[PDB]
């Protein structure tokens, strides 16, 4: 089956490469049936130590995508769900590599598109680590678990696994998925409130697919309220073209916390009968309460003279002796020591071809004792 | 010849980008363009221009005249090599390759230049060839090719004093440091303004004077303005020919804040229309405002906000929205009170603000070695 | 005249020294000079930064305060950063090109 899986794939590719969905889905399909007979002989018959399993986890994995680009959206995927649970069941028992990897993003890719429970199953899953999954499934895998906590409420946990999924991604083209990690990676940091310039590398990514999405954060970097609505009507459908719009819809909170940190930082003794009008809130009577919960949830500290109307704010300086930037260090002290440690641990593979530590010689040592014997008799 | 060749690029800027202003530029630029053998650099300028339908014979007479100069190189190279002088071929096109550089494109102008670079054993030709490569490296804005021959340039002035090859050179590096927003370096290269000469590219020495004052008024502080640009006889007399800039400079120095914005709109609008300042005049006056605000505002602690309209610059709410975005922009170190109508200042000790840039650069290099350590070793 | 500027300011740093705050009406009396040109001149001290402090418009209290800030520690560690960034840029030129 190194010959019959390669001589399966080698005709299983060029049918399904161009795809030819015109009288080719059943030929593709039956050829997938033959390769599935090889795959069942792989699942059952002497996969030990041969890379029968391992060599055909690459063939199985790559045929899952043509399988998944004729036999997913055109055909029923939910049968390939239970076939894939069986494929995972025979995985991780006999062998723990190459079946622990692909069978989980390849499990993930339509469950994310669905709303099935299997995000918490992915929490309690053992195969969350597939142990150095070849920097392609491994790289995208962190993105595939990034959107998990996106739809399950990013609490700044996965922006490092989005960033990590980004930095493990290759040099091919951004239009594959690197657009969507380039968009969604910050989409979760717009959820936090922080934002950099995104459009800084205008290669083949920072001219085409940004303008609604940078136009979004252009409104977020303002302290304006209905400017967000002027984005949200303008490209409500463009954000529905990807399907991020349910994460887009919740940003009015971070817009108004951006505004209250902005004004509460800017002015000091400012009336509440000014901030509703300046924030175009159209109601000061609950602008006691947005301000009040801005005190409640953390953000701003000082008091409102609710009787008068001015919201006083105190001048809090000298955050240095406040021991926050020691923590901003110690997060990075430990990590920078770690990346020196990894620059050590990745370094010592070279040490090789060190054949012989020859001290001096043998015959020249015999000449040294010989001429030494001449000078000693002399 | 490359000595009038910058005005050509500035009038390309004058042609395209002011959209309504596109008639006298396509007059005088054509007036320079369909003479002096110019063939190559204006096809897409003709595309941005009108039709100009019958340019065929106009190009044919000039590729013909160009063919005369090329065929007389072809008349020159063989009598040059039969009796060889100092390689008289490259001695002919060491001077007419700049005709290949203005008239020809950068390829026949580049090769022949790197060709003739190996001819003259002294830098008296070499470094001027390098000056030509710098000047075309500006025309095609070859921002990496200028990095090479700037260092390759500077490598020759150490032997000799060559202050016509260094003080001239500092004009180029000042134009690059003002091309980018590197203004403390642009005035620093513009520090002398004496050994700088009545140039070819700023044929008004006083235009050079305007540029070094516009960059210096941001680049240096008072302890430097109140000694340096106020006591230079070399600087006072040339702007004594200037009414506006003399007023524009002295309106900050003589605390004349209300008439300062009056000239600021004019100078800033001139900087708007100017080539090469057009990338950064916004960056200019957004610093000029907060500089003029900080200068007066670090004198008083209990100055009200309705002081600055009638005395500093009119519009109370204009001052309000302008200051609110600067404290809210994280600069302009003070704190404005609102409903008792008073502005307070504070002082940040240089322990937090100095800390800020440190954590910025540490995060940047963290990103850098993070990215490289992912990139190498697969 | 120019010597009178330096003598004016030599007295002006002399009497301002022993305190933290005062009103302009006493220093006008103690140098025996006016208040407008002294107010503008003190403003020029804190514009030219030769003297530092702050001024008031309600009554003219000059709040004087000084400490030498820590400067050597952070920036001298900060330019090493932009050295090493360029060093990593050179690591492209023996690492990215090579293997």
């Amino acid at each position: 089956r190194p010959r019959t899986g390669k001589a399966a794939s080698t005709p299983l590719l060029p049918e399904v490469e161009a795809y030819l969905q015109l009288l080719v889905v059943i030929f593709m399909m039956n050829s997938k049936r033959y390769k599935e007979a090889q795959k069942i002989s792989d699942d059952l018959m002497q996969k030990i130590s041969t890379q029968n399993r391992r060599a055909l986890d690459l063939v199985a994995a790559k045929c899952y995508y043509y399988h998944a680009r004729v036999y997913e959206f055109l055909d029923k995927l939910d049968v390939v769900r239970s076939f894939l649970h069986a494929r995972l069941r025979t995985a991780t028992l006999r062998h723990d590599a190459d079946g622990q990897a692909t069978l989980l993003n390849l499990l993930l890719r339509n469950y994310l598109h669905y709303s099935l429970y299997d995000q918490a199953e992915k929490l309690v899953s053992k195969s969350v680590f597939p142990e150095q999954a070849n920097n392609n499934e491994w790289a995208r895998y962190l993105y595939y678990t990034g959107r998990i906590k996106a739809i399950q409420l990013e609490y700044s946990e996965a922006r490092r696994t989005m960033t990590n999924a980004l930095r493990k991604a290759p040099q091919h083209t951004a239009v594959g998925f690197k657009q969507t990690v380039h968009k969604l990676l910050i989409v979760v940091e717009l959820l936090l409130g922080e934002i950099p310039d995104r459009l800084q590398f205008r290669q083949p990514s920072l001219k085409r697919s940004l303008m609604p999405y940078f136009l979004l954060t252009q409104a977020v970097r303002t302290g304006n309220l209905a400017k967000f609505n002027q984005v949200l009507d303008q490209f409500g459908e463009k954000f529905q073209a990807d399907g991020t719009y349910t994460l887009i819809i919740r940003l009015r909170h971070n817009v108004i916390k951006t505004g209250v940190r902005m004004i509460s930082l800017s002015y000091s003794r400012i009336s509440l009968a000014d901030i509703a009008q300046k924030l175009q809130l159209d109601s000061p009577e609950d602008a006691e309460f947005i301000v009040a919960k801005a005190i409640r949830d953390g953000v701003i500290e000082a008091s409102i003279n609710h009787e008068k109307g001015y919201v006083q704010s105190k001048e809090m300086i000298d955050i240095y002796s406040t021991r926050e930037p020691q923590l901003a260090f110690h997060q990075r002290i430990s990590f920078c020591l770690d990346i020196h440690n990894m620059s050590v641990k990745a370094m010592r593979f070279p040490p090789k071809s060190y054949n012989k530590d020859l001290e001096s010689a043998e015959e020249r040592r015999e000449r040294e004792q010989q001429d030494l014997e001449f000078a000693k008799e002399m | 010849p490359k000595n009038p060749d910058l005005r050509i690029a500035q009038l390309r800027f004058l042609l395209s980008l002011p959209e309504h202003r596109g008639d006298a530029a396509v007059r005088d630029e054509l007036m320079a363009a369909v003479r002096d053998n110019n063939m190559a650099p204006y096809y897409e300028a003709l595309c941005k221009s009108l039709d100009w339908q019958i340019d065929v014979d106009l190009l044919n007479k000039m590729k013909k005249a160009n063919e005369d100069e090329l065929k007389r190189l072809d008349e020159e190279l063989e009598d040059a090599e039969k009796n060889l002088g100092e390689s008289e071929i490259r001695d002919a096109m060491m001077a007419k390759a700049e005709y290949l550089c203005r008239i020809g494109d950068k390829e026949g102008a580049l090769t022949a230049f790197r060709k003739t670079y190996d001819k003259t054993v002294a830098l008296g030709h070499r470094l001027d060839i390098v000056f030509y490569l710098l000047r075309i490296g500006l025309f095609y804005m070859d921002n990496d090719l200028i990095t090479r021959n700037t260092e390759k340039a500077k490598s020759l002035i150490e032997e000799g004093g060559d202050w016509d090859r260094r003080n001239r050179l500092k004009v180029y590096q000042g134009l690059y440091c003002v091309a980018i927003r590197d203004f403390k370096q642009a005035a620093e290269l513009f520090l002398d303004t004496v050994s700088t000469f009545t140039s070819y590219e700023l044929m008004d020495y006083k235009t050079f004077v305007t540029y070094t004052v516009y960059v210096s008024m941001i680049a240096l502080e008072r302890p430097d303005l109140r000694e340096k640009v106020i006591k230079g006889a070399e600087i006072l007399e040339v702007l004594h020919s200037l009414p506006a800039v003399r007023q524009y400079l002295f309106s900050l120095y003589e605390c004349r804040y209300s008439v300062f914005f009056q000239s600021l709109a004019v100078v800033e609008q001139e900087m708007k229309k100017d080539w090469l300042f057009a990338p950064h005049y916004r960056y200019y006056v957004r610093e000029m405002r907060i500089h003029a605000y900080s200068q007066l505002l670090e004198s008083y602690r209990s100055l009200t906000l309705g002081y600055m309209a009638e005395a500093f610059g009119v519009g109370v709410e204009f001052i309000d929205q302008e200051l609110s975005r600067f404290i809210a922009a994280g600069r302009l170190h003070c704190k404005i009170d609102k409903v008792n109508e008073i502005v307070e200042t504070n002082r940040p000790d240089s322990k937090n603000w100095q800390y800020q840039e440190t954590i910025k650069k540490g995060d940047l290099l963290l990103n850098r070695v993070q990215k490289l350590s992912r990139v190498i070793n697969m | 005249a120019k010597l009178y500027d330096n003598l004016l300011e030599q007295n002006l740093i002399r009497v301002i020294e022993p305190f933290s705050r005062v009103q302009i009406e006493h220093i006008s009396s103690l140098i025996k000079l006016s208040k407008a040109d002294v107010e503008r001149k003190l403003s020029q001290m804190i514009l030219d930064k030769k003297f530092h402090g702050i001024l008031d418009q309600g009554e003219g209290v000059l709040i004087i305060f000084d400490e030498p800030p820590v400067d050597k520690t952070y920036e001298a560690a900060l330019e090493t950063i932009q050295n090493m960034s360029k060093v990593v840029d050179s690591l492209y030129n023996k690492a990215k090109k090579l293997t």
Partner: peptide
């Protein structure tokens, strides 16, 4: 922070000095 910031880059430079000792030795010797 600065000392740990240098040390990693130094050892990285040392690994590049190893990969030159690997890639242009495998083809040369065999």
């Amino acid at each position: 922070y600065l000392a740990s910031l240098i040390r990693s880059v130094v050892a990285l430079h040392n690994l590049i000095n190893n990969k030159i000792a690997n890639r242009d030795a495998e083809k040369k010797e065999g």
